Structure 1
Amino acid sequence: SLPLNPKPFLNGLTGKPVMVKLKWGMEYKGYLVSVDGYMNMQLANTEEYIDGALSGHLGEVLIRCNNVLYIRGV
């Protein structure tokens, strides 16, 4: 399709349940609430997943760009 830049893709992904996995192996799944220009993420009602198994719910979770490895919109 049309070539989409990652910044409108991150701006349009707010309010949708996504999952951001870090370089340490752990992932946080939740609704994306805030995404700034420095690739920082702030989510609400986040759930932690480690090695394919859920750990627990934390709520509002803030993840920086230096630790987040990838993000997938579910």
Structure 2
Amino acid sequence: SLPLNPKPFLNGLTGKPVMVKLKWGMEYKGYLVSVDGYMNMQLANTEEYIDGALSGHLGEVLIRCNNVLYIRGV
């Protein structure tokens, strides 16, 4: 696309199912409620996938920005 930046991409993905990988290898799937300037992230109906396998169903979750490796829409 004509330049698609970090910030708009993430904003487009609000209201959507996402999965976030953390640096530590945990993964969290849920609906992205919001993100902020520092790229802290809020998920609803979160699920946890560790070793790529469903571990725990967690609900509403804040992820501190420094933990994030990458975010994927899914």
Q: Give the % identical residues.
A: 100
RMSD: 0.7
**Structure 1 stretches (4+) deviating beyond 2 angstroms?**
none
Aligned to 2:31: 31
**What's the CA shift for 1:72?**
0.5
Deviations 1:16-51 (A, max 9, x none): 101001011110000000111110100100000001
Q: Give TM-score scaled by structure 2 length.
A: 0.95
Higher helix share: 2
Structure 2 gaps, min length 5: none
Give the distance between the partners of 1:51 and 1:23, measured in 2 at CA: 13
Q: Give TM-score scaled by structure 1 length.
A: 0.95
Alignment: residue pair count: 74
Aligned to 1:17: 17
